[PDB]
Design a protein around this ligand. Sequence first.
Ligand SMILES: Nc1nc2c(ncn2[C@@H]2O[C@H](COP(=O)(O)OP(=O)(O)OP(=O)(O)O)[C@@H](O)[C@H]2O)c(=O)[nH]1
Ligand SMILES: [Mg+2]
Length: 167
Amino acid sequence: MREYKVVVLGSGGVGKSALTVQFVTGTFIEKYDPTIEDFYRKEIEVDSSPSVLEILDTAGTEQFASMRDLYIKNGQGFILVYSLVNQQSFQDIKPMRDQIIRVKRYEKVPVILVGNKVDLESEREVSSSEGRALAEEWGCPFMETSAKSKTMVDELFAEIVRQMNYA
Ligand SMILES: Nc1nc2c(ncn2[C@@H]2O[C@H](COP(=O)(O)OP(=O)(O)OP(=O)(O)O)[C@@H](O)[C@H]2O)c(=O)[nH]1
Ligand SMILES: [Mg+2]
């Protein structure tokens, strides 16, 4: 069976686990449980191709950045998450693409930039077009999601598998 290794990266609270847990189970996690490291496996049909996604839900907690170089080496596609209601989390995501490329040593790593928490449109600190621009300087897809939408999360993970197939 083909198998894809995806690392979900970002700062604390942005919604990494709520996005991953919505893909894997169809449920929205409301109670913030800070994450050390968690692996999930889910059989995916993208373009009608049956594969496995193995998903690495990292910690955005400052200490575990020691591990990040191992995660980047052991991983094929990367979902880079910011919360659009927190512009510091948008700022924390910009060095991370280039950190991905120092370890991988080539330019075209399959990445997607995600502005999560779009359902909280009142609280928005980061505009669509700031993210949209970052994604195009980075040459990657851009999505704004709400971990509350099964449909929005599903498209995110299906597009990471499409990205790992035209890499
Ligand atoms: N409104 C809204 N809340 C969200 C969304 N995604 C996550 N949350 C909430 O944000 C909080 C943090 O979400 P998590 O996904 O647990 O955070 P994380 O980014 O995995 O955090 P770390 O594990 O510390 O890296 C929780 O209370 C979630 O319920 C979203 O799309 N919309
Ligand atoms: Mg988490």
